[PDB]
């Protein structure tokens with residue numbers, strides 16, 4: 112009595128759901144296919160970015176729970192569920208460890224000039240060791256923008272294990288949270304820009320953070336400093352980032368998120384040896400996919416058994 | 430009087446020697462320049478790889494201490510110094526943090542397939558994200574070969590911060606050292622090979638460890654496992670490593686040390702996308718150079734004051 116609008120990130124969530132419910136799978140949804148199989152179901156799983164409009168909720172009679180595939184909920188008609196007594200739940204933060212490790216990977220890679228030194232050896236220029244010198248992270252200053260799930264885990268590892276001085280900028284967290292991860296929360300963003308040897312951004316994308324890192328920000332940063340962005344592409348005004356690299360306002364950057372996405376085949380950032388990329392894979396591990404599949408599949412069984420799930424979007428229904 | 434055959438890695442070691450001794454510096458030393466300036470000095474610092482033969486030792490009348498720039502001592506005639514009552518000291522272990530960070534850099538890089546994913550994006554193959562999936566380190570098993578200065582620091586960070594199960598193989602270490610870094614010391618090496626998802630080498634190069642990682646070792650390793658070598662090139666028999674990669678006995682490797690060194694323009698390892706390189710820079714940071722310069726400069730002053738230095742190579746002179 113459950114419909115899967117799109118496949119889950121891991122098959123374990125499908126096997127678990129088949130233990131307790133009659134499961135139906137729609138693989139590539141169109142405007143008409145969804146409804147003719149949604150009219151009688153009691154639970155629905157929506158894969159981002161597939162959309163679920165008011166026409167779909169109106170036809171699902173026994174529907175009691177809507178679950179997204181991840182944090183994204185913009186494609187779902189929340190209003191149609193709050194009035195009808197339907198609880199809607201998302202699955203956020205289940206790739207926190209993945210991006211935390213991925214962020215660390217890019218900080219170390221920039222410090223050890225990894226991708227550059229790899230090509231030099233691969234092209235027989237092993238003697239580049241006489242001209243290039245890596246950087247030791249122990250003792251350097253890390254600037255964390257956004258002390259959320261990822262920012263805290265990154266801060267915790269860099270301050271204690273890597274023995275870095277971690278500054279944090281996040282006005283929406285209690286003043287005592289930065290001390291729990293041995294970081295120092297600051298109130299002025301300019302202070303974090305001038306003092307950091309590395310700047311890694313993990314904030315939510317808001318109207319405030321949209322293009323928060325423009326040319327005005329890059330000027331304040333040390334010329335030897337580096338930028339890491341695993342959050343969202345729009346957080347950095349990319350032309351100003353191209354300017355900072357070319358005019359050497361910063362020593363380099365590591366980029367997992369782009370604007371626009373996907374980045375064009377001839378992105379000007381590709382030319383620089385001090386900029387490295389990953390194709391938006393920071394939170395894409397097999398383990399993270401299982402967690403999203405489990406959390407989404409399991410919260411379905413919670414509502415069908417009367418238990419309050421942890422990630423309700425409309426609390427006015429409980 | 431103290432002679433510097435070559436500059437120290439940092440000027441701080443030279444300033445310290447000038448505080449207490451009459452210091453002379455030869456920047457690009459020749460064999461005959463050494464002879465004409467060593468006759469009256471009482472301490473000498475030799476920058477690798479310059480050689481100090483019996484002819485130079487024989488001409489140094491007031492000589493009481495010889496200090497190398499690092500761990501390397503093969504260019505010094507120890508026998509000719511041991512006979513004349515001259516103490517020889519090296520400078521090992523002064524880049525422990527550097528190699529620890531560099532080792533971590535390569536473990537993360539392999540897990541996130543960094544250089545491969547970097548080239549794909551830079552060449553317009555951004556859609557490689559649909560075919561390749563990174564690895565999450567949390568929960569995987571790290572096999573540390575050699576639980577010394579570097580092996581312990583790598584173990585401590587990987588066990589607690591990165592949340593890995595850390596195994597260690599080292600028959601010459603007390604059983605309780607692995608517990609101080611939240612690792613598990615094992616007595617059978619085969620156990621570490623079969624259980625590890627990552628194997629990182631940090632042993633001393635002895636006749637026991639010489640080519641310790643041959644084809645028999647690679648067969649026991651998981652096909653999904655990776656190899657990291659920042660210790661010495663002879664610890665891995667390079668042909669067997671080339672075979673293991675090509676026959677897919679292991680998932681990849683990271684190499685900072687080679688045998689032979691330097692690697693040629695046509696090293697067979699270069700063809701593979703799952704093998705990454707650094708040109709023997711794991712322990713080469715500005716901080717590491719300062720520490721080595723201090724230790725080398727300090728052991729010179731220690732012998733000139735009658736104090737026993739900690740890194741004597743020929744203890745039979747004391």
Ligand SMILES: NC(=O)c1ccc[n+]([C@@H]2O[C@H](COP(=O)([O-])OP(=O)(O)OC[C@H]3O[C@@H](n4cnc5c(N)ncnc54)[C@H](O)[C@@H]3O)[C@@H](O)[C@H]2O)c1
Nearest residue numbers: 220221224225226227228242243244362363384385386387
């Ligand atoms: N991929 C990365 O993560 C990363 C990060 C930082 C720097 N780099 C690269 O590493 C190199 C060193 O970093 P830096 O900040 O000290 O730059 P730098 O210009 O301040 O000093 C680098 C030295 O190495 C020499 N050199 C640099 N690039 C070379 C090349 N392609 N071929 C031959 N010789 C070269 C230069 O003559 C210079 O003296 C730069 O080319 C930079 O683009 C790469």
Ligand SMILES: NC(=O)c1ccc[n+]([C@@H]2O[C@H](COP(=O)([O-])OP(=O)(O)OC[C@H]3O[C@@H](n4cnc5c(N)ncnc54)[C@H](O)[C@@H]3O)[C@@H](O)[C@H]2O)c1
Nearest residue numbers: 257258259260261280281283313314315319341342393394
């Ligand atoms: N590259 C990937 O694969 C990937 C995966 C997951 C998440 N992300 C992104 O990484 C980022 C971090 O994720 P998260 O789980 O930590 O989110 P989160 O909700 O846990 O934390 C976001 C933080 O941003 C802070 N913040 C809000 N406005 C700010 C501002 N003006 N200045 C500074 N800080 C501000 C908030 O107080 C919050 O603590 C998000 O933007 C998310 O979309 C990327």
Ligand SMILES: NC(=O)c1ccc[n+]([C@@H]2O[C@H](COP(=O)([O-])OP(=O)(O)OC[C@H]3O[C@@H](n4cnc5c(N)ncnc54)[C@H](O)[C@@H]3O)[C@@H](O)[C@H]2O)c1
Nearest residue numbers: 538539540541542543544545560561680681702703704705
């Ligand atoms: N740190 C690194 O640089 C690193 C580490 C491991 C693997 N790799 C590379 O990543 C790729 C995938 O890793 P794997 O161990 O899972 O290999 P795999 O043989 O287990 O299969 C990988 C999957 O991705 C696809 N794929 C593999 N190589 C591809 C390529 N060059 N272009 C497009 N699609 C490809 C295949 O269709 C397959 O389904 C391999 O090419 C491997 O050499 C790089």
Ligand SMILES: NC(=O)c1ccc[n+]([C@@H]2O[C@H](COP(=O)([O-])OP(=O)(O)OC[C@H]3O[C@@H](n4cnc5c(N)ncnc54)[C@H](O)[C@@H]3O)[C@@H](O)[C@H]2O)c1
Nearest residue numbers: 575576577578579598599601632633634637659660711712
């Ligand atoms: N730039 C570089 O890449 C760089 C820098 C420094 C050192 N190194 C090399 O890496 C290693 C540095 O490690 P370290 O500083 O901790 O030295 P270390 O002496 O403190 O540790 C070496 C360990 O090897 C262990 N070992 C000896 N025989 C073994 C065996 N048969 N099996 C397993 N383990 C054995 C010893 O018990 C010892 O603990 C050395 O090989 C050194 O030459 C490389």
